[PDB]
Design a protein around this ligand. Sequence first.
Ligand SMILES: N[C@@H](CCC(=O)O)C(=O)O
Ligand SMILES: N[C@@H](CCC(=O)O)C(=O)O
Ligand code: NA
Ligand code: NA
Ligand code: NA
Ligand code: NA
Ligand code: NA
Lengths: 263, 261
Amino acid sequence: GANKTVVVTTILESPYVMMKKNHEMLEGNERYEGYCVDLAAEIAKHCGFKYKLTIVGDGKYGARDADTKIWNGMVGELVYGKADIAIAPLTITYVREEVIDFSKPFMSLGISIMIKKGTPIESAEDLSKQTEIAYGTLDSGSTKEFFRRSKIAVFDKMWTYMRSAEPSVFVRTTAEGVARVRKSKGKYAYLLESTMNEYIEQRKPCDTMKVGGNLDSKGYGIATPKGSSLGNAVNLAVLKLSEQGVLDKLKNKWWYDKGECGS
Amino acid sequence: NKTVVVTTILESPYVMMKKNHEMLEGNERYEGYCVDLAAEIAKHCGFKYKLTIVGDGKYGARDADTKIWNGMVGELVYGKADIAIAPLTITYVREEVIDFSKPFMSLGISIMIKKGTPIESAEDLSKQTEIAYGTLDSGSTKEFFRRSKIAVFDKMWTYMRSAEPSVFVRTTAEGVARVRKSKGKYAYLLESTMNEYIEQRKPCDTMKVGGNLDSKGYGIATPKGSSLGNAVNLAVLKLSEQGVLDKLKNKWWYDKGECGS
Ligand SMILES: N[C@@H](CCC(=O)O)C(=O)O
Ligand SMILES: N[C@@H](CCC(=O)O)C(=O)O
Ligand code: NA
Ligand code: NA
Ligand code: NA
Ligand code: NA
Ligand code: NA
């Protein structure tokens, strides 16, 4: 085919993709900064393409509606032919792998627990065995599906509580989870990926922290539509950037170099 | 149908000989994390299989002169095996010539010392000469050093590649033995998974020090273009999501720890 600008679907999720301070003065890809913005640039340079960052319209990662079977989110953008690639903290999962292609992971993570400092909770088991502290997850992403599908007793118990809790314990964006932890005087804990958690505990006012081990072990991948010829080069580029140390540099740059909570 | 030929490697606790194996036959000779994994993948994908220990006992590297692949990788490239189920690192050079599932385990390169050795990091190794150190032959750790442009790692490579006698070993067990027997004068660079397993084994004289040097994964490998790959990769993601991989890990690493809780 002719030369074409690659349409990249991504999500406003700190520190992956953020609005730059002076974004009102800026246009196109220059509006944004963060780990995935830098990662996009690196993949584009290796794979020899021009591209356009496009924030996903509905703000979601991607789930399939059980009634209509329509995919939302970034996954929907690839499934339905709107975008050419997803460069974002998109978890490689079974149900997504059936419908899109994924690179090998560019980051490793697991589900984890965020508390307001001081909350008397150290583990999933501790959340599951009490009722005073509410807890939930992001909508339309892999963490909620983790709970919904777990056969492990403690996780199952947690899903059973979460799915029926009133008011709703689920949040639309990670920022909304963070505010609910910060504002709830220790009466809400948030289940989110260790990568997001670790970032948030580096930001003022330093009132949150990760507790416990991770609940699972998995990875974020760069996604393309099933069968897209871009996949092979993009997967090699990931592995090369991993091997060169560039992914490690990017993680330190966006998580720790400008940390607001010490060390 | 047809029996799937699985290449693997004798590497504790992934594949080990059972007690009394000399009277056993076939797949029943072996036990460990990758034996259990192979069984799970075969069940999910609907195939019979035969485990076969790689003839040359290597993971796989390409000879710079001949461009021939050895090890498990060579098995798959030259058509001797249909799948590899082993702690085989997903790497750029390998990805060019075989297919890989998404990772079934996460790991990084790490440092093993005999307890009390005055080393706490790679940097520490690189700044002295009393304590020798090396890696496995024919694997991803050795390639990591050979190819690194990071100063500390490049410096390590320069030393290792020229050190006399050789600091490289043929098997992980040999590297561990060398650590154990060298009175603190040998440290070994190996994957955090293996390091963690050995520090749970008697005589409890080794330990992992410092952070991991990198972050990567093991995958199930198949020859490039094999029709097994799709189903295998989905099976790894299912076993992951069902918590089976975590259960296998706990069974083979920690259940049997001999060096405390
Ligand atoms: N990374 C997740 C979103 C965050 C979460 O669900 O905790 C996904 O790809 O769905
Ligand atoms: N997992 C490695 C072998 C161990 C090592 O090199 O430390 C490989 O696939 O080459
Ligand atoms: Na796919
Ligand atoms: Na073999
Ligand atoms: Na180390
Ligand atoms: Na499950
Ligand atoms: Na688990």
